[PDB]
């Protein structure tokens, strides 16, 4: 199956997966100085206070930390959305080396890492509905660089030992996600795609400007994970990023003047 090695990465999903080579897939690069204002969008409202944690997974390409969408609780609306989005999980990309890690990149500069938070169209009663509408799904997406210590983080590191390769899971309960978001909410916006397979075009991707700090030591928690289960030979969980892909038909819009 896919992975991110040479020999199941990125340039191979094609096969099984031809949307790979579609009209809104994702990441992209964001040409900053090409985005343009939008006086349209709305603004942007992030609502975690009632957010309910559940269980941390090594699924074998990253871990998820998954939430109860069983009501609306954890939501985002707003901005370019229309309705209510509601949380479902979030994971991370990350590289082996600081100096990449992103799957977006800004005038082509990578991140050592990027936070996805995965929201869910509630017009649509499941995320199994959402991805197979246009507007099913809004991603979150948070740059990652290594400085200081993102305290709201510390939790997350220090249980990737409990699950360390694929197929592992503890309980994660208690967890406020509110705590890996930057200061501003400024933002640029567009209609993309899952970043893994199944590749589906679903997302309203909302990436925001601000990166949030996190220090070496954090990251190099991420990078002692494994993509292999248990009793396999050790293969380092790094590098889980797709690389930009083409703009095509699409625009770039900032929240901001
Ligand atoms: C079943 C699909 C699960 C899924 C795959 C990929 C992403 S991402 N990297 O945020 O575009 C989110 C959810
Ligand atoms: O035709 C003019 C319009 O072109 C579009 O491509 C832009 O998104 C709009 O901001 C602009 O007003
Ligand atoms: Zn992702």
Same mark, same amino acid.
């Given at each position: 199956h896919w992975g991110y090695g040479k020999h199941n990465g990125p340039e191979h999903w094609?096969? $099984?997966? +031809?949307?790979?080579? %579609?009209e809104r897939q994702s990441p992209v690069d964001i040409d900053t100085h090409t985005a343009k204002y939008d006086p349209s969008l709305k603004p942007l409202s992030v609502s975690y206070d009632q957010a309910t944690s559940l269980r941390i997974l090594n699924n074998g390409h990253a871990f998820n930390v998954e939430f109860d969408d069983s009501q609306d609780k954890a939501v985002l609306k707003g901005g370019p959305l229309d309705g209510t989005y509601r949380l479902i999980q979030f994971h991370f990309h990350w590289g082996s080396l600081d100096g990449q890690g992103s799957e977006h990149t800004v005038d082509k500069k990578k991140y050592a890492a990027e936070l996805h938070l995965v929201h869910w169209n509630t017009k649509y009663g499941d995320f199994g509905k959402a991805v197979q509408q246009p507007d099913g799904l809004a991603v979150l997406g948070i740059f990652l660089k290594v400085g200081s210590a993102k305290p709201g983080l510390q939790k997350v590191v220090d249980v990737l030992d409990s699950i360390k390769t694929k197929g592992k899971s503890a309980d994660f309960t208690?967890? $406020? +996600?509110? %705590? /890996? /978001?930057? #200061?501003?909410? $400024?933002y640029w916006t567009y209609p993309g795609s899952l *970043? *893994?397979?199944? /590749? /589906? #075009?679903?997302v309203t991707w909302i990436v925001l400007k601000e990166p949030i700090s996190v220090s070496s030591e954090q990251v190099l928690k991420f990078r002692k994970l494994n993509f292999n289960g248990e009793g396999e030979p050790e293969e380092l969980m790094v590098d889980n990023w797709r690389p930009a892909q083409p703009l095509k038909n699409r625009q770039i819009k900032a929240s901001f003047k």
């Open positions: 094609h096969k $099984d997966f +031809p949307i790979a080579k %579609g208690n967890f $406020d +996600p509110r %705590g /890996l /978001l930057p #200061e501003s909410l $400024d *970043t *893994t397979p199944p /590749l /589906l #075009e679903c």
